[PDB]
């Protein structure tokens, strides 16, 4: 069941492939084979190694034309060390976010990225969250994508003090910066910062609103 092509996936093309580290790397598509219920894509990485990957574990080595992607799109994006990591498009370019894509990564991390920092996954699952390993992440994305565009958020201002959840504990914290749908939270006991989605119930006011 060997193939030279599969629609726009052609043997010899440049490609990104997911390694066991969960990070994504440049390589070449060297074979396509039907194994059991679907296709496997054999990738030879530029730096080191080969892998046989499912079509949701390869990505195109080009950036999307902006309006190709939408909320729920499965992508690889620059995670700012710096790595390429898998995620979901949570918000597309607009004036409020300065024309950036909001990415919710597979591990729960969130950040805004530019059009030249993301790569569409070749064959995502129809329900795009179903290949997210971490179950709390998987569930969150299903809920978020399905509820879109209904996004309850809290209005927060720089200098405002709130409790923010992390690791089972609610911590004294401070709002350092607002950036579109993200808020930069300073945890006051240990002095670390985290960018958090303004609709996340890890923010006390958002938790308390529901």
């Amino acid at each position: 069941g060997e193939l030279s092509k599969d629609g726009d996936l052609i043997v010899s093309m440049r490609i990104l492939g997911k390694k066991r580290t969960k990070t994504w790397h440049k390589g070449t598509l060297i074979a396509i084979q039907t194994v059991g219920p679907g296709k496997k894509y054999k990738v030879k990485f530029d730096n080191k190694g080969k892998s046989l990957l499912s079509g949701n574990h390869i990505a195109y080595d080009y950036h999307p034309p902006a309006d190709k992607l939408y909320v729920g799109s499965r992508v690889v994006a620059k995670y700012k060390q710096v790595w390429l990591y898998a995620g979901i498009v949570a918000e597309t370019p607009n004036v409020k976010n300065k024309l950036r894509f909001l990415i919710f990564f597979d591990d729960g991390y969130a950040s805004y990225v530019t059009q030249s920092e993301l790569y569409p996954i070749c064959r995502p699952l129809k329900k795009t969250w179903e290949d997210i390993e971490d179950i709390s992440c998987r569930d969150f994305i299903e809920e978020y994508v399905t509820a879109y565009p209904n996004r309850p958020m809290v209005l927060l201002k720089s200098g405002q003090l709130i409790k923010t959840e992390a690791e089972g504990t609610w911590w004294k914290s401070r709002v350092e910066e607002v950036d579109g749908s993200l808020v930069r939270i300073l945890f006051l006991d240990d002095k670390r910062c985290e960018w958090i989605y303004r609709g996340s119930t890890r923010l006390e006011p958002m938790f308390s609103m529901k």
Binding site: G108, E165, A166
Partner: peptide, 10 residues
């Protein structure tokens, strides 16, 4: 990595 994810732990 240091992420706390999108929802409280669980």
């Amino acid at each position: 990595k240091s992420t706390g994810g999108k929802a409280p732990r669980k």
